[PDB]
Design a protein around this ligand. Structure first.
Ligand code: FAD
Ligand code: DJ0
Lengths: 132, 661
């Protein structure tokens, strides 16, 4: 029931009146606390400003052009050999494997796993990828 | 309504009997509701007839002829009600033409100390009741703290000048009996900071509102946190205001710390994000170089060389996608951080100019209570608040002294007679007084009863101005110690021409420091002739009493010259400065509810003193020493109407004692 925007906790009233010079001590430590928070903002601004200066140039010198490839249903020998290496490197990450081959959907990759499971020792290859 | 208005104008509930009435009509208040309603109508209608014409005595026969059935059937009841109202001063008080001339046989002898308003009102009553009354007055005039300066056409009040609302106010009746020129006080009151410039309306209103909120806060502090004793002493209004202000200053700093901490938290979240990006950029830079080398192994290549190009390509675009998301998050954080950097909470609770204008409002409260806020009881300082009259405040244009002078007509008043000693025993009283002009002339007044209306300041005096033999009991002297008696002074400035705003009755001067906030803080334009009154309140009151009039008037003219211009303010033709604390017949201005006191001390002040028996084993004596004055009336202290009411009370009490009820 205090007036709106007035602030009067029992806790604070006792803190400002427990001692003859309690109030000024309270407001003093709050002042110094604000000084050390502003000091700390200055350090992080200056630290962040140096980091931004390293990101000058973005990653634009390093972005490759994006090629779209018509997703083909048929597996050339070359595309099979890519997939086996992609399995060796990426494991069950069907998305990464699709991106490497370029013309094979995530489903076609997953289906490839079953059909050539036997002929390509795909189980051995997954075990091989797990050792590192 | 009419009979209902009569009750309201007599400060009575119209539909209920009071404790006083219960005491004189126990048969009625303990009896059926129907008779109580009949009683209440008789009382309200008798009050009404009196109020509708307070210039002539309302007699019992007159009252009865005006009552109509069924109410005029119980003539004993009507006569009882009329006698009760008359005896207690609710009808036929003040100055009225008497139908039945006063009987020559007087009964009992009363000495009244003091011929201020309380003493005079009691005296008029007691004489109306058939007693022999003499007033002893130390000054060379009546009125006491109603004190009007008169010189030429200049008229200005050095003491009381405001009649509060007329609704319920007994001064309403008096004003129909005396030619008082009452004039409304327009409460518009511009403030001028110490540089003579006006306070902008924006600021005048912000700070006044904050002033009102700080008061509510102290009351919350008092009633909800029970902050009423601190380090074994009663908390004062001023002290509670300090705590409230400290906490508002604390909250501003708490709010700043919370805000800059949100900026730190965000900055650090950004720092962590940038480090993530810088490392990712390097990882991307190195990965590109690898994709570049592998793709420069020119075809035709075996399928591992092809896989190297295509998987470096894949890894690089993924890292680029990861980097693009981190850079989207970076722009959102820099947004959040630019909004925070633009929403800073308030810098200060109050600027220096604010706190000065605030001090003016505190000085205004110190004026109304005639005392520094550090002396006011936090718990009780506004205890008479529920009794405020209704209507506009008014000034007495022809000088408030017209009231005590009018009341004094017909009374036996010994001016220039300072009471030195009050003797009261089971057989009667002796009042010993001296001539103030030559103190060697001693006077003895013997009487059945003494009504003491000495100001609370005089009762407080150590060593005493007035000795009571036997000494007042401790329950009364302790009350006298606890009660506050404050101080307030006025500077009357009489010019030959009006240079202020004539349509503005008040204007303020905002002092530069808290210490000086009460010093000449308020000016009044109230009179027909060009007169300004300037107030000295709070801590300034007592200090300015030890400064010469020429310096005080100089400070006044300096303030006014700053507000209105140096060429606009001529020298005053006449000036007067009050020094009420130094006045030995007052020793202050009026009472206040001090920290450590309360409303019950006003009841204690009002209680009469009863001496012990002369012969031991003799029956209980009657009371001999009575008290009135503004310090004796709980619900209307520190006013003229309170003093008048207190005299009416004591006269009923004394007459009941010595004439019978
Ligand atoms: C500056 C000032 C401003 C005020 N403004 C407000 C206002 O505007 N309106 C309002 O309603 N009230 C106001 N008051 C208060 C009001 O004036 C008083 O409460 C009231 O007038 C006092 O009445 P009283 O009869 O109790 O005491 P007083 O009028 O003080 O009467 C006591 C009398 O006893 C005399 N006396 C003292 N010692 C002795 C002695 N030893 N022997 C004999 N006689 C003695 C005194 O001289 C005096 O005449 C103001 C008062 C002052 C001083
Ligand atoms: O000039 C003296 C002021 C006397 C005074 C003392 C009171 F205790 C109550 C009053 F009504 C009053 O007079 C008008 C007033 C009212 C509110 C604030 C300030 C003054």
């Amino acid at each position: 029931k205090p007036p709106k925007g007035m602030f009067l906790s029992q806790e604070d009233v006792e803190a400002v009146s427990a001692n003859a010079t309690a109030a000024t001590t309270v407001l003093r430590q709050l002042d110094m606390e604000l000084v050390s928070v502003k000091r700390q903002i200055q350090n992080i601004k200056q630290t962040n400003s140096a980091l931004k200066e390293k990101l000058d140039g973005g990653i634009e010198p390093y972005r490759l052009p994006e090629v779209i490839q018509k997703c083909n249903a048929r597996w050339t020998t070359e595309e099979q050999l890519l997939a086996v290496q992609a399995i060796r490197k990426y494991g069950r990450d069907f998305q990464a494997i699709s991106d490497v081959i370029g013309n094979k959907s995530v489903v076609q990759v997953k289906n490839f796993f079953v059909n050539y499971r036997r002929r390509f020792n795909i189980d051995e290859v997954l075990q091989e990828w797990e050792a590192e | 309504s009419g009979v209902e208005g009569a009750a309201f104008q007599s400060r009575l509930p119209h539909d209920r009997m009071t404790s006083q009435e219960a005491a004189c009509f126990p048969d009625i208040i303990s009896g059926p509701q129907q008779t109580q309603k009949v009683f209440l109508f008789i009382r309200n209608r008798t009050l009404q007839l009196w109020l509708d014409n307070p210039k002539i005595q309302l007699t019992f026969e007159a009252t009865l002829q005006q009552l109509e059935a069924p109410y005029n059937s119980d003539t004993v009841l009507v006569h009882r009600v009329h006698s009760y109202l008359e005896r207690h001063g609710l009808i036929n008080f003040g100055i009225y033409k008497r139908i039945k001339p006063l009987p020559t046989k007087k009964t009992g002898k009363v000495i009244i100390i003091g011929s201020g308003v309380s003493g005079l009102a009691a005296a008029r009553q007691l004489q109306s009741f058939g007693m022999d009354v003499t007033l002893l007055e130390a000054r060379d005039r009546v009125g006491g703290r109603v004190a009007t300066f008169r010189k030429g056409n200049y008229v200005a009040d050095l003491g009381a000048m405001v009649v509060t609302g007329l609704g319920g106010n007994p001064m309403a009746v008096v004003s129909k009996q005396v030619n008082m020129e009452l004039a409304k006080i327009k409460q518009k009151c511009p403030l001028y900071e110490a540089n003579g410039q006006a306070v902008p309306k924006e600021k005048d209103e912000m700070v006044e509102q904050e002033f009102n909120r700080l008061l509510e806060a102290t009351s919350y502090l008092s009633h909800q946190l029970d902050f009423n004793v601190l380090n074994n002493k009663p908390v004062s209004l001023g002290q509670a205001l300090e705590v409230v202000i400290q906490l508002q200053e604390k909250h501003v700093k708490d709010e700043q710390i919370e805000h800059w901490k949100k900026i730190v938290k965000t900055q650090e979240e950004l720092k962590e994000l940038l480090n993530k990006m810088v490392n990712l950029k390097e990882k991307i830079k190195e990965l590109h170089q690898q994709y570049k080398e592998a793709s420069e192994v020119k075809p035709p290549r075996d399928i591992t060389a092809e896989f190297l190009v295509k998987s470096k390509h894949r890894d690089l675009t993924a890292l680029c996608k990861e980097y693009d998301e981190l850079a989207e998050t970076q722009g959102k954080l820099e947004e959040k951080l630019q909004e925070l950097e633009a929403n800073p909470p308030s810098d200060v609770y109050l600027s220096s100019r604010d706190r000065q204008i605030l001090d003016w409002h505190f000085a205004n409260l110190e004026f109304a209570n005639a005392t520094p806020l550090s002396t006011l009881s936090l718990k009780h300082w506004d205890q008479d608040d529920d009794f405020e009259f209704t209507g506009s405040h008014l000034t007495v244009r022809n000088g408030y002294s017209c009231v005590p002078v009018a009341l004094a007509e017909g009374l036996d008043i010994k001016l220039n007679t300072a009471v030195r000693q009050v003797r009261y025993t089971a057989s009667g009283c002796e009042v010993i007084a001296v001539n103030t002009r030559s103190t060697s002339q001693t006077f003895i007044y013997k009487c059945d009863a003494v009504l003491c209306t000495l100001p609370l300041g005089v009762l407080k005096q150590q060593p005493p101005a007035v000795q009571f033999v036997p000494p007042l009991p401790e329950w009364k002297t302790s009350a006298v110690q606890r009660m506050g008696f404050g101080n307030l002074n006025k500077v009357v400035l009489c010019f030959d021409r009006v240079f202020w705003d004539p349509s503005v009755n008040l204007f303020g001067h905002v002092g530069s420091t808290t210490a000086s906030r009460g010093e000449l803080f308020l000016f009044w334009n109230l009179y027909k002739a060009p007169i300004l009154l300037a107030l000295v309140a709070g801590e300034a009151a007592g200090i300015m009493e030890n400064i010469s009039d020429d310096v005080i008037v100089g400070r006044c003219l300096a303030i006014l010259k700053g507000i209105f211009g140096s060429s606009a303010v001529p020298q005053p033709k006449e000036t007067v400065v009050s020094r009420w604390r130094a006045d030995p017949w007052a020793r202050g201005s009026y009472s206040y509810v001090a920290a450590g006191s309360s409303g019950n001390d006003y009841d204690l002040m009002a209680q009469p003193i009863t001496p012990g028996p002369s012969i031991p084993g003799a029956p209980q004596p009657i009371p001999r020493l009575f008290f009135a004055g503004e310090h004796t009336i709980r619900n209307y202290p520190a006013t003229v109407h309170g003093a008048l009411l207190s005299g009416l009370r004591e006269a009923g009490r004394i007459a009941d004692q010595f004439l019978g009820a």
